[PDB]
Amino acid sequence: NSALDFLKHHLGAATPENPEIELLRLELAEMKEKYEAIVEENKKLKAKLAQYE
Amino acid sequence: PENPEIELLRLELAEMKEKYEAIVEENKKLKAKLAQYE
Secondary structure (H helix, E strand, O other), X not given: OHHHHHHHHOOOOOOOOOHHHHHHHHHHHHXXXXXXXXXXXXXXXXXXXXHOO | OOOHHHHHHHHHHHHXXXXXXXXXXXXXXXXXXXXXXX
């Protein structure tokens, strides 16, 4: 039963907040921020080259 | 720590970083090729 299943997963010992995991998640978010910025720049450089060639 | 969840997170962090070093490298070529017209 999907109802019981969901209940069975959301009940019990929650996951203790691990400091290493929180860090890594913030590094991931941070790295993704930087990546998306450069994707913007990368798209601008490509727009410029379109003018030439 | 030899924790699957932690190691998985490190793998994703490493991938995102690899995807990021590729555009950084990708633009290197662009800027350089761009000044062949500008």
